[PDB]
């Protein structure tokens with residue numbers, strides 16, 4: 281049963297709905313971004329049209345082996361016609377290749393589906409500024425006022441400065457960064473850039489990053505772990521046992537590990553500033569949890585919605601409980617009434 285919030289009324293379209301088999305009456309499947317909760321179900325045996333960004337299409341072809349003839353990449357910021365309906369893809373400020381989708385229905389209704397996004401004032405000067413939006417399908421991941429986090433820029437500043445200090449003090453320290461999907465590439469790339477190193481990683485992860493068209497990426501990534509003092513490992517291995525084991529494997533080249541876990545939100549943020557963040561330490565291993573988010577804070581989300589002024593909001597995250605649903609609807613009404621509507 282495909283939920284109603286993945287269906288676009290008045291069209292043959294669904295969004296991020298690949299885990300339900302053949303959806304009744306769906307003539308085109310849209311994919312907002314290459315994260316597994318959204319792509320779950322796609323493979324080389326999928327034979328319906330898939331619409332997506334160029335970067336997402338590269339990942340579909342190379343990582344999942346979807347046949348080229350079924351992949352329909354669209355340029356960003358360009359009016360395109362799909363099965364007789366005008367659509368536009370907009371940058372979602374999430375992970376690489378992530379998009380929001382504007383649909384212009386034949387009857388004059390305009391719908392924005394945000395996919396996963398981190399709202400930014402820069403969005404207020406895209407093609408969104410050019411017409412009224414009637415229905416908003418909203419990424420409500422952090423739709424509660426306790427969810428505050430710093431800007432991405434402040435978090436990268438903290439990580440750069442921490443890593444540069446540690447390695448300048450001890451030239452035999454290794455830096456490790458955790459990953460389990462695309463996104464948050466700036467964490468490991470900015471650290472490698474300040475240390476004059478490439479980022480070393482598995483063949484599989486190097487393959488994934490090569491699909492992204494990031495400029496000068498051959499210049500910052502490698503599969504040669506020996507030449508690199510910044511290593512990427514699976515997020516599962518960013519703990520004291522996993523990191524002790526990795527250090528053993530580096531053959532006496534290194535005597536200390538500084539590791540980063542770039543999680544979305546921690547509850548340090550409620551009582552603490554970014555400058556006040558401290559690691560967990562055991563022996564010669566330190567682990568920093570840094571609040572690098574690729575989803576809107578509560579205040580960022582509020583500003584975006586109050587600017588857009590949609591007639592109806594359909595949440596796409598935290599929809600499974602009555603308590604969550606009720607809480608989100610109360611915030612939406614607050615936001616409306618504060619602007620005088």
Ligand SMILES: COCC(=O)Nc1c(C)cc(C)cc1C
Pocket residue numbers: 585586587589590591592593612613615616617619621
């Ligand atoms: C009825 O639900 C939708 C809604 O409340 N929308 C809305 C919000 C959230 C804020 C502003 C400033 C204006 C509008 C129209």
Ligand code: NI
Pocket residue numbers: 313315374396
């Ligand atoms: Ni996502």
